[PDB]
Amino acid sequence: KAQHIVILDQEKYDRILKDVPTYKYVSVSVLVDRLKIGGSLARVALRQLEEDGIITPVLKHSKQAIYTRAQ
Amino acid sequence: MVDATAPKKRTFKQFSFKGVDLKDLVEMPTEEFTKLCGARVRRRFSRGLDSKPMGLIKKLRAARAATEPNERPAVVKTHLRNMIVVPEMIGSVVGVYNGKVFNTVEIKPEMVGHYLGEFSITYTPVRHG
Amino acid sequence: VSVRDVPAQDFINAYAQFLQRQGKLEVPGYVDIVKTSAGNDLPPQEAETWFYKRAASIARHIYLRKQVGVGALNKLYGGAKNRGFRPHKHVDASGSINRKCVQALQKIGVLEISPKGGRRISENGQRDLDRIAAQTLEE
Amino acid sequence: AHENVWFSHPRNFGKGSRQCRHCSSHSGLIRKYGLDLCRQCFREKAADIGFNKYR
Amino acid sequence: QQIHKIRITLTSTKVKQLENVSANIIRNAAQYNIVKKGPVRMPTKVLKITTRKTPNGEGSKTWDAYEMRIHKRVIDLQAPASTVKRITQITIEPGVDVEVTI
Amino acid sequence: PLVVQEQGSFQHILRLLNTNIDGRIKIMYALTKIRGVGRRYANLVCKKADVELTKRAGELTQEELERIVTIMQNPTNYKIPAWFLNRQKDQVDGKDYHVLANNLESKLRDDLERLKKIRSHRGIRHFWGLKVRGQHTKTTSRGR
Amino acid sequence: TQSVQTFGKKKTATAVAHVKAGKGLIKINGSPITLVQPEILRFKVYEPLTLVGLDKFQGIDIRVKVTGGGHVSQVYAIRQAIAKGLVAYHQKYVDEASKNELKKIFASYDKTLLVADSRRMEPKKFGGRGARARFQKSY
RNA sequence: UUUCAAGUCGAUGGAAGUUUGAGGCAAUAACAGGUCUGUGAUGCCCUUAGACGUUCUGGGCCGCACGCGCGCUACACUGACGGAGCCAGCGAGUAUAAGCCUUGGCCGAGAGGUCUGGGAAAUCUUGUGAAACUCCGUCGUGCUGGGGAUAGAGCAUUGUAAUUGUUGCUCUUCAACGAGGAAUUCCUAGUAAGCGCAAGUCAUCAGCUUGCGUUGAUUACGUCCCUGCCCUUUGUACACACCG
Ligand SMILES: [Mg+2]
Ligand SMILES: [Mg+2]
Ligand SMILES: [Mg+2]
Ligand SMILES: [Mg+2]
Ligand SMILES: [Mg+2]
Ligand SMILES: [Mg+2]
Ligand SMILES: [Mg+2]
Ligand SMILES: [Mg+2]
Ligand SMILES: [Mg+2]
Ligand SMILES: [Mg+2]
Ligand SMILES: [Zn+2]
């Protein structure tokens, strides 16, 4: 029943930048769980959001990415 | 998928084994023929042919020479069922022991490259009920 | 600074970048086709760079030891094969890939055929590897 | 003629290629350290050979 | 064929005769002013054979575990070859075999 | 190396060699649905066609799709090794081939009658649906 | 000069520590301790350091060679060789009052810093795949 | 605590305080338990030249509507792959053979081939650079990149001989299985569980045993409730002893 979205359109993209900052804790599963996007799409979003400064890296690991809001 | 091509032509079909048709197939020396078949056959001929396979070929050759009205070439019987069928012996009929009886097989051209005893099953099939 | 004073994992990522950017390493034509080991089931995921990274590992691995052969390199990078229903087993890596790397590396430098077997590191091999270690740790 | 057939099959690299020193059996042979003895003949000669049970 | 660094290799199953011959040779290499190296205790080899107890194939799966320990010692002497060989005949023992290599 | 967006270019369902392919699967593993195309084979045709593996099936353009189906139909012309092929040293013409979706079962069948026509032992057991490679059947393969 | 050599052991792993007088060099098989590959266990070898304070290692340099055992078993052998080497150096070249002080903090935190674990693998017995495990029985 | 006895439970010291851990040996008798398919160990019976002796050739012991037992892979994300990191121990090893362990170099995508050299061995294979494992990536809950049966085609090794594929490798084919009812097994510390490696069988073949080491726990440290055995009392018309 999952049918998670793997292609990023524009409606979801700006919705992401409007919703991810208002999260206590973001991770690979959090993006999948609440944004309905796929796991692979979640991983690329986290690696860019850190470069754009919106997201602060709490911990770095291959199997787990622990991130938090930067404000 | 680009498209869907389906032409085909009637090239006067004749049996062919790995690119060599029946006409040329029959007149190949077994040394040249083995160079275009499987790995197991190629290994066997390099390991050295003992006297038993070579003796059977001579008798199979003679059995064909026995009849020249062009009917079946009479049967040579043998136990050596590890014999590899070669184009030279196409059309000959051999009786291959399966442990009890002389199963009779006719060497069809499509049988080439197989073991001679592979066409004489050694066990009667199971039948429950 | 020496090779032993820098972490191995991020040193190879730095030596791999240099060997690719240097471009002098001769890459065999089958690197986009072959699998590293008979125990593997798929080719490497980093098609463009896997050969460079493996050569960096071979060069670094030879630095810390003495006369390692090419047969030993197959055992080192080999892993457990996934036999279907039979238990797992260790299987050696491909011989050609390891032999080509050290041969490709021998005319680009760092190594040479050592006495009493194996492949020693070259007079210049210590000079330029220790260099890479320095350009690894400034950040 | 007959001499070329009698005992003509090769009897090397096989289980029938070797036999027990003692009973000339073919099954349960021990080849370690060149013993070439059946496992039953070994037990009745182990003390004589110099094999003892310690652990 | 005068002075010669000569190695004597001692192997046996039992250690008492091995150490008696080893000590007796070392002792004889003391009163004779001969510089010596040894004895060197080589790592002992445990020859283990594990068979089934049953001559037939019935019962609980019980196994014997036979053993044959082999101990090897080498002693280095600096003496002429005539001198070393006669020391061997002095310390001859039925259990221990001797091989002499130059 | 960053998240990108597109509109109307993605294709949810592809049709290659008369087989329907889901467009949201990664290209290397989407092609494995085509019978005769395994994971190992799909990795090479994408790399020979200069199609980077980080793309979903629907992301591909028509130019790339035709370039892939062209390579699969002519593997030897693109430095694909003979030993890497599906059907090498073919029975009738002796050349190295790689049979695909609507051709594999045809030549697999033709091999079965070719075994059954000569009445080989392997062909007979294939007819019964039993194991032909000597596996024991005393205690295994009892389903239907 | 003032040199003492010691060793620590785990199941099979044995780490030989050489403690010489110097500037404070602390290496693992010729590599700094800051780069041990059991990253999750890097603080196991950091424990003998931060417990007493790094000022104790100003005058001594330590070079260990650890062989045998496994990845984890080697870490416990290394940390024991370091802890025992520091104590053995103080007993021989410093007053024994300081040596008893250092030995107190280590033991009060973890006994394995100074005392080798005596556990070894139990032999396997026939009738089962393990030391105590047995083949499944049927009636 | 205790009959202040035998002991038991806690600490301290200690390498070790469960008989220090683990085994080897192991009583008085006994079983119609299993083996004459280990014996040039055997009594008797059968056969002994058209052999039931021995040998050659080929097949079978693998044969398949089915029930059961010892096991191996798995059913996934505490994971699969792809790279990178890279640590053991127990052992074995040959000559004019009938061919041992085989590094190093050179060919091959692999399996493997070839040329030299070391080792009758703490010397060389070998630090057996093993696998789980760790790091960085791809995958993203999908019978999916889990799983790898079944099968087609091709390439090598051993062997006189591979067909009923010995085994290995390449591509393709990618099935049940989505954690398993009634029942039932093993186990208390470097133990269980994984994870590999060596030796035996072995020309070739280990999903098997015998050991070894790597990672390494949860939970009792109690009871006779189930089950088996031992002891005492008891009944007996049994003593070939309840298979009476
Ligand atoms: Mg069409
Ligand atoms: Mg090798
Ligand atoms: Mg690896
Ligand atoms: Mg037939
Ligand atoms: Mg107990
Ligand atoms: Mg026979
Ligand atoms: Mg059992
Ligand atoms: Mg991995
Ligand atoms: Mg051989
Ligand atoms: Mg009770
Ligand atoms: Zn015997």
From Swiss-Prot, chain B:
One of the GO BP terms on file: ribosomal subunit export from nucleus
Subcellular compartments: Cytoplasm
Keywords for the protein's UniProt record, in alphabetical order: Cytoplasm, Ribonucleoprotein, Ribosomal protein
InterPro entries per the UniProt record, alphabetical: Ribosomal_uS19, Ribosomal_uS19_CS, Ribosomal_uS19_euk/arc, Ribosomal_uS19_SF
One of the record's GO molecular function terms: RNA binding
Gene Ontology CC terms, in alphabetical order: cytosolic small ribosomal subunit
Pfam families: Ribosomal_S19
Chief location bin: cytoplasm
Family: Belongs to the universal ribosomal protein uS19 family.
Subunit structure comment from the entry: Component of the small ribosomal subunit. Mature ribosomes consist of a small (40S) and a large (60S) subunit. The 40S subunit contains about 32 different proteins and 1 molecule of RNA (18S). The 60S subunit contains 45 different proteins and 3 molecules of RNA (25S, 5.8S and 5S).
Role according to the record: Component of the ribosome, a large ribonucleoprotein complex responsible for the synthesis of proteins in the cell. The small ribosomal subunit (SSU) binds messenger RNAs (mRNAs) and translates the encoded message by selecting cognate aminoacyl-transfer RNA (tRNA) molecules. The large subunit (LSU) contains the ribosomal catalytic site termed the peptidyl transferase center (PTC), which catalyzes the formation of peptide bonds, thereby polymerizing the amino acids delivered by tRNAs into a polypeptide chain.
Protein's name in the database: Small ribosomal subunit protein uS19
Annotated source species: Candida albicans (strain SC5314 / ATCC MYA-2876) (Yeast)
Curated annotation (Swiss-Prot), chain D:
Location(s), subcellular: Cytoplasm
Gene Ontology CC terms: cytosolic small ribosomal subunit; yeast-form cell wall
Assigned keywords, A-Z: Cytoplasm, Ribonucleoprotein, Ribosomal protein, Zinc
InterPro entries: Ribosomal_uS14, Ribosomal_uS14_CS, RIbosomal_uS14_euk_arc, Ribosomal_uS14_sf
Any one Gene Ontology BP term: cytoplasmic translation
Co-factor requirement: Zn(2+)
Keyword Ribonucleoprotein part of the UniProt annotation: yes
Single Gene Ontology MF annotation: zinc ion binding
Record-listed Zn(2+) binding positions: 20, 23, 38, 41
Function: Component of the ribosome, a large ribonucleoprotein complex responsible for the synthesis of proteins in the cell. The small ribosomal subunit (SSU) binds messenger RNAs (mRNAs) and translates the encoded message by selecting cognate aminoacyl-transfer RNA (tRNA) molecules. The large subunit (LSU) contains the ribosomal catalytic site termed the peptidyl transferase center (PTC), which catalyzes the formation of peptide bonds, thereby polymerizing the amino acids delivered by tRNAs into a polypeptide chain.
Subunit record text: Component of the small ribosomal subunit. Mature ribosomes consist of a small (40S) and a large (60S) subunit. The 40S subunit contains about 32 different proteins and 1 molecule of RNA (18S). The 60S subunit contains 45 different proteins and 3 molecules of RNA (25S, 5.8S and 5S).
Family: Belongs to the universal ribosomal protein uS14 family.
UniProt name for this protein: Small ribosomal subunit protein uS14
Organism: Candida albicans (strain SC5314 / ATCC MYA-2876) (Yeast)
UniProtKB/Swiss-Prot annotation, chain G:
GO molecular function: RNA binding; structural constituent of ribosome
GO cellular component, as recorded: cytosolic small ribosomal subunit
Keyword terms of this UniProt record: Ribonucleoprotein, Ribosomal protein
UniProt keyword Transmembrane present: no
BP GO terms, sorted: maturation of SSU-rRNA from tricistronic rRNA transcript (SSU-rRNA, 5.8S rRNA, LSU-rRNA); translation
PROSITE patterns the UniProt entry points to: RIBOSOMAL_S9
Matches recorded under InterPro entries: Ribosomal_Su5_D2-typ_SF, Ribosomal_uS9, Ribosomal_uS9_CS, Ribsml_uS5_D2-typ_fold_subgr
NCBIfam families: PRK00474.1
Similarity remark: Belongs to the universal ribosomal protein uS9 family.
Protein name from the UniProt record: Small ribosomal subunit protein uS9
